Paper text:
A number of studies have addressed the pathways downstream of the intersectin-1L GEF activity, which is highly specific for the Rho GTPase Cdc42. The intersectin-1L SH3 domains negatively regulate the in vitro GEF activity of the adjacent DH domain.
We were unable to crystallize the SH3(E)-DH-PH fragment, but the SH3(E)-DH fragment (1151–1431) yielded well-formed, hexagonal-shaped crystals, belonging to space group P3221 with two chains in the asymmetric unit. The linker connecting the SH3(E) domain and DH domain (1204–1225) is well ordered in both chains of the asymmetric unit, with residues 1210–1214 unexpectedly forming a short α-helix. The DH domain (1226–1431) is an elongated helical bundle structurally homologous to other DH domains of known structure. The SH3(E) domain from one monomer forms an intermolecular interaction with the C-terminal half of the DH domain from the second monomer. This interaction occurs side of the DH-domain opposite the Cdc42 GTPase binding site.
Residue numbers in the entry: -1 to 0, 1151 to 1426
Write the structure that this text describes.
Amino acid sequence: GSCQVIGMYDYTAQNDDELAFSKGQIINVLNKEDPDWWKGEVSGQVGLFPSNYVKLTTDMDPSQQWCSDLHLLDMLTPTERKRQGYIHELIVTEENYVNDLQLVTEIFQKPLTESELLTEKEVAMIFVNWKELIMCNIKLLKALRVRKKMSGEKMPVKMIGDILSAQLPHMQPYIRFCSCQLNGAALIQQKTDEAPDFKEFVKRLAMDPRCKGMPLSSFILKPMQRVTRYPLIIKNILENTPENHPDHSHLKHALEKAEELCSQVNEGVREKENSDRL
């Protein structure tokens, strides 16, 4: 089964059929036949490598990636550490996510609603209820920030499910946005093909350093990506919350609201794509 590993030491290839890598480098594992020589790939290059020189990423403590600076982290149980780790993966990636949404508007939406290089409808077709998403997610973010503040600067957070359980219901605008992003994507391509003024303008918009080289056709995919990601993170938090824990019940409720949001979103996408045959 495909998975990632990180190099725990440097390794120079000793034979032509080997994969050389550096400490800290992540390599994609293609197979683990030989329990000593994994087949890996790094940047399109495939080779065998010593399995004892590597560490599965899934075996890495999540608190070490998302909150290594948490206070008293080393005093917590191994299971509460993972719980803090996943809680912070949720909060950190949310900050990351909300800011990217904002970024799209600032450097792509507004600069296009002024470009006059396309109608008022052609802007809705691409960004649809994008602004609406920024609103319900900013609400979530603010709520998480507050809980984070309530808990103490770099202090373990005890509850999170209540906020997610409460916040997920307002995520309904995603069904609409995700359902229409398929055309919005076609639109952007049509224009960047028929309107030379367009291809150039949107090419300039995208070179803003904060885009790190990502075209608007990929930023537009983020709302869907975020919706499918939630369940995954919430389930990991739940799994590290015992049933006698005061947040357990909320987490269970939140996982559920998150899973169906994702279902509703995916149903809408399919529905909308099917109706484009009638």
